[PDB]
Design an enzyme around this catalytic site. Structure first.
Site, PDB file in Angstrom:
ATOM      1  N   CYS A  37     -32.642 -11.487   5.838  1.00  0.00           N
ATOM      2  CA  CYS A  37     -33.840 -11.645   6.876  1.00  0.00           C
ATOM      3  C   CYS A  37     -34.643 -11.445   7.743  1.00  0.00           C
ATOM      4  O   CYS A  37     -34.627 -11.463   9.045  1.00  0.00           O
ATOM      5  CB  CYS A  37     -33.983 -13.634   6.026  1.00  0.00           C
ATOM      6  SG  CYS A  37     -35.743 -14.329   6.917  1.00  0.00           S
ATOM      7  N   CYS A  40     -36.301 -14.178  10.300  1.00  0.00           N
ATOM      8  CA  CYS A  40     -34.816 -15.299  10.350  1.00  0.00           C
ATOM      9  C   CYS A  40     -34.711 -14.801  11.986  1.00  0.00           C
ATOM     10  O   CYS A  40     -34.274 -14.981  13.042  1.00  0.00           O
ATOM     11  CB  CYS A  40     -33.934 -14.900  10.084  1.00  0.00           C
ATOM     12  SG  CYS A  40     -34.919 -15.874   8.145  1.00  0.00           S
TER      13      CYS A  40
END
Ligand code: CL
Length: 111
Positions: A37, A40
């Site tokens: 991600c 993230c």
């Protein structure tokens, strides 16, 4: 900065439960993450910084959704990253998205 990271990655739900008790009364930031991600990873240095800045009042726990699917399912995670804030097992707030200013604001307003 505030290198290293006091960001502990929980291994399982039982491990999380034990982490929460150790947190005692401190604000707990659950950071639902994934290595694939992009947003993230972009917010990770911020979390490291905050973990050090507020080590006395905050506990940052990283929850990898690929390794701890049960926890992700339990907190009904769908957006990445998602931050869940707890204190004494009580949910304080939650939001999704790599917003550094918002993350710091939530912590400052809840300690
Ligand atoms: Cl800053």
């Amino acid at each position: 900065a505030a290198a290293a990271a006091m960001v502990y990655q929980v291994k399982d739900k039982a491990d999380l439960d034990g982490q929460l008790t150790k947190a005692s009364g401190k604000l707990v930031v659950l950071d639902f993450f994934a290595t694939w991600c992009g947003p993230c990873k972009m917010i990770s240095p911020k979390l490291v910084e905050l973990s050090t800045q507020f080590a006395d009042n905050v506990v940052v726990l990283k929850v990898d959704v690929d390794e701890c699917e049960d926890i992700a399912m339990e907190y009904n995670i769908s957006s990445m990253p998602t931050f869940v804030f707890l204190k004494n097992g009580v949910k304080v707030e939650e939001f999704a998205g790599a917003n550094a200013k918002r993350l710091e604001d939530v912590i400052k307003a809840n300690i």
